[PDB]
Structure 1
Amino acid sequence: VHLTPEEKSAVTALWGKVNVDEVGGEALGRLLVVYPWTQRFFESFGDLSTPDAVMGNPKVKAHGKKVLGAFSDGLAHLDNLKGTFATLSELHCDKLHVDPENFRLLGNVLVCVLAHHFGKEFTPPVQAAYQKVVAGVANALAHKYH
């Protein structure tokens, strides 16, 4: 994924203020609420029957933290997303068989969550840079389909 130097430091600057313990669970939780078929993949996580149950579920939160961590690895290695996400692509594609359209949905939910938290500071140019990043992650996760 090809970012301008401008875009690069706007992304890294904003991400430094992200609560690594929270935003992942907020993003994952919203995926499961907004796009309820995604719950199929998380049956062992227990109670997901209502929005409040999803957001307050400690496994969504704990798994959310891992998902966000992989996004951070991505941000540290934008010239090598395919390599960075290679074993996770195996997992999500060969083992879990998650349809890749769902990778594009999570990426966009994460963008809505960043907007929710940063308000005015999540400017349109900043969004445009994060859209390139999350598309790059989704495409790297899908590498084993194609």
Structure 2
Amino acid sequence: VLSPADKTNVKAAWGKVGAHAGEYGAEALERMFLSFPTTKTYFPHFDLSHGSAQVKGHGKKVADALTNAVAHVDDMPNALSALSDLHAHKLRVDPVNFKLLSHCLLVTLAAHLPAEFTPAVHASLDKFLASVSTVLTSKYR
């Protein structure tokens, strides 16, 4: 459950991603695939090489979904219902993998937004990503 301060922090911090959405999302995916190679099992037919255009394109989708989540942060299950159906019902992604990607998103944000990534904002972003992860790993239709 996010506090009002959490929502404020997330909107402010994620708001700085902007046109770098694809780049940051792709970097987070690349970090995950490299650091935690078991995650690649979910993408059996992807080109997961360094600099892959396919990973770049997928990074944009992830980042844009996070933008969507921020714009609906008080009502996320209804806003992300399609993504929950994909990840929980169709793909059956083990919940541990969401912790891995969430960590890699935090690392990416820490590496690119040093001024923004204060301890308080770090805490809020972690809670936000945990909340998104819970929605995407739940079946609630």
> Conserved in 2, the CA contact under 8 Å of 1:23 and 1:68?
yes
> Conserved in 1, the CA contact under 8 Å of 2:21 and 2:64?
yes
49, 53, 56: which one aligns with 1:58 = 53
Aligned to 2:44: 43
Residue type of the alignment partner of 2:61: K
> Conserved in 2, the CA contact under 8 Å of 1:27 and 1:106?
yes
Cα deviation per residue 1:32-86 (whole Å; 9 max; x = unaligned)?
Answer: 111101111112222x3xxxx33x1110110011011111111111111111221
Give the alignment's Cα RMSD to 1 decimal: 1.6
Aligned to 1:14: 13
Give me the whole-angstrom Cα distance separating, in 1, the residues matched to 2:82 and 2:42: 18
Unmatched runs of 5 consecutive residues or more in structure 1: none
Does 2:61 align with 1:69? no
Give me the whole-angstrom Cα distance separating, in 2, the residues matched to 1:8 and 1:80: 12
Q: Which has the higher helix share?
A: 1
Give me the whole-angstrom Cα distance separating, in 2, the residues matched to 1:7 and 1:94: 29
**How many residues are treated as equivalent by the alignment?**
138
> Conserved in 2, the CA contact under 8 Å of 1:23 and 1:113?
yes
Unmatched runs of 5 consecutive residues or more in structure 2: none
Normalised to the residue count of structure 2, the TM-score between the two structures is: 0.89
User: What is the percentage of aligned positions where both structures have the same residue?
Assistant: 43
Normalised to the residue count of structure 1, the TM-score between the two structures is: 0.86
